[PDB]
């Protein structure tokens, strides 16, 4: 799965650059879809949240992200895409 | 020799005519390729009633398509038998009908009626012996009503002595899918009364009831609806196209069904009509044919035959069946329900036998009835028209293309006179 890993890494790097540019918080948008606060949202939920954020992602890349984070671990997705208040480097 | 030229006005009339030519080519053994593949000589014996031969031996329908929109033209052409029709019979305009009788009869239809009449005149001249003009349209639409009325009006002077069948689809409240049914139907009926020597009313609600209870179909499209209309539209010309023990034609039907000039509105019925599950169980016989034929649920009108009295009726029985039996069954139904008929016009029913049954049918019958209960539909349309006209709603559209309130008042008066004639003849006594 080297090709899939490389594609996922490139997609995450692009989303990281876009989120760093926009300085936008993804947690409320992604967590509205998690009604039970279980940390899991489905692929449609992740797709709608990313389209909300206008992330530069296509349907195939976006389904690939959902499968990689598989439900979708939106918390880990937000951690990876990173923010000034919410990044892996924050911890 | 004796032949019918068909016209299809509006999208409703166009699709009905498309299915009618479906059925006719089925009977005459004509594939979409236009050649003849029938297994009988009887099909070719009188194939010139609806078809004209080409240079290559193929057969082309005598159909003139009419609509201010090209969408239904394209759909009919793309249909399975759309390759049969002559492209120069596809008369259409760029601007849509706008669902307006004024648009279809005075401004947009006037500029195309010249070409339409040119095509019709060419067909009539090419035909050896003109017999009838049949038109298929809906009175509730814009170009099906207005342009169809204009076409029959201008055809009347050109050919005063030739039969004029109209297959007019009058809408019903259960199927009311527009808001200008009253205006369009009122402005069309007064034209039909003096411009059609036999009008035949088709009601979507009743065909739908047929599909629901007589055939027990859950989710049918317009396909079997147009098939139901085409059944009678083809069975009318059964004696025209095929031999029989008691031949007839359009004028035999009209002479035996029109006692007075303004009473020429007919309701249609087809027998037999059974679901697939009960198809093998039911024994097809003339008894079942007549029982279903004189039943409301088989009629193609949302009009109740009990509240009316049949002035005249006609059963075109198709198939090999015995003349005494059909005639005595008509006598039996008359005697059983004399109240349902009219006393002063004895022998109300017209039995005509055609040797060739419909393909796949052992025997069948088409019923054409001049029953009084058409006055109910006329009354409901008049009530709706009066309700709209008092408050003037949706009238600025019609006055835009040059019409005035005088035409609407005259149409309302004509419809009132038409319904009053049926009312008088319902309770008229010897």
């Amino acid at each position: 799965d080297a090709e899939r890993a490389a594609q996922v890494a490139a997609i995450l790097s692009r989303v990281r650059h876009n989120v760093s540019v926009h300085n936008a918080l993804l947690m409320p948008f992604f967590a509205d879809f998690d009604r039970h606060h279980r940390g899991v949202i489905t692929s449609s939920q992740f797709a709608q949240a990313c389209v909300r954020h206008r992330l530069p992602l296509t349907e195939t890349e976006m389904h690939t992200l959902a499968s990689w984070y598989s439900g979708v671990r939106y918390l880990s997705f937000v951690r990876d895409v990173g923010c000034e208040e919410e990044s892996v480097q924050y911890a | 020799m004796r032949e019918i030229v068909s016209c299809q006005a509006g999208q409703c009339g166009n699709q009905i005519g498309s299915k009618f030519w479906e059925v006719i080519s089925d009977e005459h053994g004509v594939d979409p390729t236009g050649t003849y593949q029938g297994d009988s000589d009887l099909q070719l014996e009188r194939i010139n009633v609806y078809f004209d031969e080409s240079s290559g031996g193929r057969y082309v329908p005598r159909a003139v398509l009419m609509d201010l929109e090209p969408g239904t033209m394209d759909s009919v052409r793309a249909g399975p038998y759309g390759q049969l029709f002559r492209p120069d019979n596809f008369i259409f305009g760029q601007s849509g009908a706008g669902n307006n009788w004024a648009k279809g009869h005075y401004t947009e239809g006037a500029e195309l009626i010249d070409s339409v009449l040119d095509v019709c005149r060419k067909e009539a001249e090419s035909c050896d012996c003109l017999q009838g003009f049949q038109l298929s349209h809906s009175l509730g639409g814009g170009t099906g009503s207005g342009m169809g009325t204009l076409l029959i009006s201008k055809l009347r002077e050109e050919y005063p002595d030739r039969i004029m069948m109209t297959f007019s689809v009058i809408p019903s409240p259960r199927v009311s899918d527009t808001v200008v049914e009253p205006y369009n139907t009122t402005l069309s009926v007064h034209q039909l009364v003096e411009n059609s020597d036999e009008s035949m009313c088709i009601d979507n609600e009743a065909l739908y009831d047929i599909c629901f209870r007589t055939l027990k179909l859950t989710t049918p499209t317009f396909g079997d609806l147009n098939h139901l209309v085409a059944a009678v539209m083809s069975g009318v010309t059964c004696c025209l196209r095929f031999p029989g023990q008691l031949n007839s034609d359009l004028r035999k039907l009209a002479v035996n069904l029109v006692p007075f000039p303004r009473l020429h509105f007919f309701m249609m019925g087809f027998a037999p009509l059974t679901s697939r599950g009960s198809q093998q169980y039911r024994g097809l016989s003339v008894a079942e044919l007549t029982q279903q034929m004189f039943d409301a649920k088989n009629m193609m009108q949302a009009a109740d035959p009990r509240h009316g009295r049949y002035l005249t009726a006609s059963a075109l029985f198709r198939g090999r069946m015995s003349t005494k039996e059909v005639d005595e069954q008509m006598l039996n139904v008359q005697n059983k329900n004399s109240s349902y008929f009219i006393e002063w016009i004895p022998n109300n029913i017209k039995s005509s036998i055609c040797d060739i049954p419909p393909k796949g049918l052992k025997m069948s019958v088409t019923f054409i009835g001049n029953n009084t209960c058409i006055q109910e539909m006329f009354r409901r349309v008049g009530e709706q028209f009066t309700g709209m006209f008092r408050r003037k709603a949706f009238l600025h559209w019609y006055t835009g293309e040059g019409m005035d309130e005088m035409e609407f008042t005259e149409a309302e008066s004509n419809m009132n006179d038409l319904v009053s004639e049926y009312q008088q003849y319902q309770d008229a006594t010897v």
Binding site: - | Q94, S176, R390
Partner: protein, 439 residues
């Protein structure tokens, strides 16, 4: 044939048109670059794109749209976004400075130096169209550009193109939620244009869409993205009758004639269903009766206006997808038997129906789910007098003491324009009451 020219005035109109065109591109298979890939085919009826997209020699498809705005932020965002290669560099008119949320500024001072090339672009779009069916202008009467420049452009189009069809999809001010304080002035002043020079006006206020999305889409915090996506879905549902084949086909004039009973009465409220949650899996395929009942329910309505306070005069229903005329007619019969909604006495039928075989298309990551069937409503009802009552009562409250009027006066408009606008709105309310009154 059957071409319709789309115009987008103001920021709201530009964003609504952006959503409409991003829907149309994926609906007709045209990529944002402007080309139809030969790898996959989305539609069967070729020339269906001819209404909204004009063919080019190289094989591309240029939209028949005019994004006109007096300020360059949104037009520059379009020029930068994914649809730059789709949209023509012209018909993308951006001014130098905004109308400042001022009807007078957008109609008298800044709009006069932009309407000339706006009309030039409209003419260059129309001469290509050999079977043009009408104009569809998206804007918001709340703002300044969409009010003033919209009025100017609508006046010029009415005087230039005669009596051709004109659909004004306008985002009216909402009863409680609002964006600006001059919004009532702009709404009242734009009524002159929306009456004399608009064949059918479609209200698309924002509270109704917000309430639709909070409830039927399970989105706690929607946005203008969802608002514009639902508006684009409504527009596509309306135009699908002429774009694709169907059992019952309707056109611009076809529904305009059945929808407008009197020349003044042409304001129609809209409602769309099934707006089912794509967040929600396991969704049962709703029936035609179910979707019709949901549409007639004021919960699933695109306009914040309760019809129970009024009475319907003419309802037009577009059924997209696998739709049976008997599902439709059973739904209509049940609706007529239902007593919670009333019609007017002089319009017994009052129902126009158009069935199209194309199911609605879903945008990437959209709140709407893939459904077999959907139905959109265009309803002319007397209940729409209440939104005018709200807006002009607010207008009177803010105008009784000369608030926010010096801007309009100094931007080149007389004081009597406000008075005649109020009188015209009062006449509109009066004739709505008259047509709704029993005979």
């Amino acid at each position: 044939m059957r071409e319709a020219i789309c115009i987008h005035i103001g920021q709201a109109g530009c964003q609504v048109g952006n959503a409409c065109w991003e829907l149309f591109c994926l609906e007709h298979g045209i990529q944002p670059d402007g080309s139809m890939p030969s790898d996959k085919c989305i539609g069967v009826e070729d020339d269906a794109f001819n209404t909204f997209f004009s063919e080019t020699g190289a094989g591309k498809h240029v939209p028949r749209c005019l994004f006109l705005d007096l300020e360059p932020t949104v037009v520059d965002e379009v020029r930068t976004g994914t649809y730059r290669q789709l949209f023509n560099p012209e018909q993308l008119v951006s001014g130098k400075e905004d109308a400042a949320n001022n009807y007078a500024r957008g109609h008298y001072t800044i709009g006069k130096e932009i309407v000339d090339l706006a009309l030039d672009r409209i003419r260059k779009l129309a001469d290509n169209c050999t079977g043009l069916q009408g104009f569809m202008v998206f804007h918001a009467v709340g703002g300044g550009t969409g009010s003033g420049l919209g009025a100017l452009l609508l006046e010029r189009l009415s005087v230039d193109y005669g009596k051709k069809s004109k659909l004004g999809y306008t985002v009216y001010p909402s009863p409680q939620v609002s964006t600006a304080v001059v919004e009532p002035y702009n709404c009242v002043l734009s009524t002159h244009s929306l009456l004399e020079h608009t064949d059918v006006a479609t209200m698309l206020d924002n509270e109704a869409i917000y309430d639709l999305t909070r409830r039927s889409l399970d989105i706690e915090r929607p946005s203008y993205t969802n608002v514009n996506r639902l508006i684009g879905q409504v527009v596509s549902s309306l135009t699908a009758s002429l774009r694709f084949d169907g059992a019952l086909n309707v056109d611009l004039t076809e529904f305009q004639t059945n929808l407008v009973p009197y020349p003044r009465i042409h304001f129609v409220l809209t409602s769309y269903a099934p707006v089912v949650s794509a967040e929600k899996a396991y969704h049962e395929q709703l029936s035609v009766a179910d979707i019709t009942n949901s549409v007639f329910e004021p919960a699933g309505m695109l306009t914040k206006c309760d019809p129970r306070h009024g009475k319907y005069m003419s309802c037009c229903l577009m059924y997209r997808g696998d739709v049976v005329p008997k599902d439709v007619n059973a739904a209509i019969a049940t609706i007529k038997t239902k007593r919670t909604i009333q019609f007017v006495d002089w319009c017994p039928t009052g129902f126009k129906c158009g069935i199209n075989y194309q199911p609605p298309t879903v945008v990437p990551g959209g709140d709407l789910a893939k459904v077999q069937r959907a139905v959109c409503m265009i309803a002319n009802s007397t209940a729409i007098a209440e939104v005018f009552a709200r807006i002009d009562h607010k207008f009177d409250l803010m105008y009784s003491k000369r608030a926010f009027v010096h801007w309009y006066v100094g931007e080149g408009m007389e004081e009597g324009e406000f008075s005649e606008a109020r009188e015209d709105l009062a006449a509109l309310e009066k004739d709505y009451e008259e047509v709704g009154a029993e005979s």
